[PDB]
Amino acid sequence: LKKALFLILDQYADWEGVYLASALNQREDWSVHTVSLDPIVSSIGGFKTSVDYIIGLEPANFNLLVMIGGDSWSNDNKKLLHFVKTAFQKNIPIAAICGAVDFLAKNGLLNNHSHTGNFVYLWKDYKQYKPISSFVEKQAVRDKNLVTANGTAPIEFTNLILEMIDFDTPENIEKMMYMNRYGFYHFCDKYGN
Amino acid sequence: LKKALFLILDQYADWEGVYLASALNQREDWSVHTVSLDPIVSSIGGFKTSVDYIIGLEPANFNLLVMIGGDSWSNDNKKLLHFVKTAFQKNIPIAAICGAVDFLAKNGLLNNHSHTGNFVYLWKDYKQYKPISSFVEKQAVRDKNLVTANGTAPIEFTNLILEMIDFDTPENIEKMMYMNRYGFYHFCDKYGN
């Protein structure tokens, strides 16, 4: 059994991690749990999520850290930083999207990986954003155990993550993503199934 | 101020209502709230949602009823039926997707509207599925104040709903949906913005 922790903060983007969460949690070998600084966080959409783990109470080791976006990432919280930074040290697969990446950039966590994000100009004055690898202008990017993406790439984000964690064969993940993006009828066209 | 109630049951589809919920809730004139039979329901993805209203405790009148899919719609719950059926009587805009539509079909709520769903063969023995309007094989369908869709059409589902409720001009909703489906870079292509 493998564990995926979804780090969500208040006012988190509803649409960003839904494809990854369902794909993973439905597996017998994968478990999805949420972690936050608060026991209850609201999505931008108005949903209230009852968080599984409060930072400092989550399992020491898990297999995937998914940092979803939202409007609360300008956080100086030392507990939060330790939590994420520790995940990097343990070298566990990490995927960040939208606001989450702004957090990574500001705390010098993007300095050794190729990446992308919402808008690089927002980081121009981040004293800790000194990348060796330049910012890539694409929906999502993967470099070793780090996948980044802008808030408009839930599907691209999910695709690269499933690849990174060897979720399934490429000619299987491709189908799942096609179904997600184009729908049953277009899928039925290109696959019949 | 207008209210949208999202009816979610246990093991609900994470990906189906995220675009509609965020689009609506961000508006000053719209509020999104969840309603269920239980105070806490899990999404297929592993998220636990703290429901706003338990059926029987939700506001008597609201502006939109969104019934999201999942694996718990084979429900004989009389409270649930009364709740939905009452919404139909008050003629409030209603949108159903995935499993939710199976519920509509079985309780004779699709007999006077054109519609679609996951698979019509599943309703072949429903004694209450006697439509005047035939089942349409498309991602999503709108007929007056009823929008239906299969589980693979979150975006189509959202598009028709925003249209039904006159959320904005078509040449505005079209852009929002393009952004949702194709991403920033493809959007920037076709609009520059």
Swiss-Prot record, chains A, B:
InterPro entries: Class_I_gatase-like (IPR029062), DJ-1/PfpI (IPR002818), Prot/Nucl_acid_deglycase (IPR050325). GO terms for cellular component: cytoplasm. It is an enzyme of class 3 (hydrolase). GO terms for molecular function: peptidase activity. Pfam families: DJ-1_PfpI. GO terms for biological process: proteolysis. Keywords: Hydrolase, Protease. It comes from the Bacteria. Its EC number is 3.2.-.-. The active site is at 98 (nucleophile). Belongs to the peptidase C56 family. PANTHER family: DJ-1_PFPI DOMAIN-CONTAINING PROTEIN, PROTEIN/NUCLEIC ACID DEGLYCASE DJ-1-RELATED. This is Uncharacterized protease YdeA. It comes from Bacillus subtilis (strain 168). The gene is ydeA.
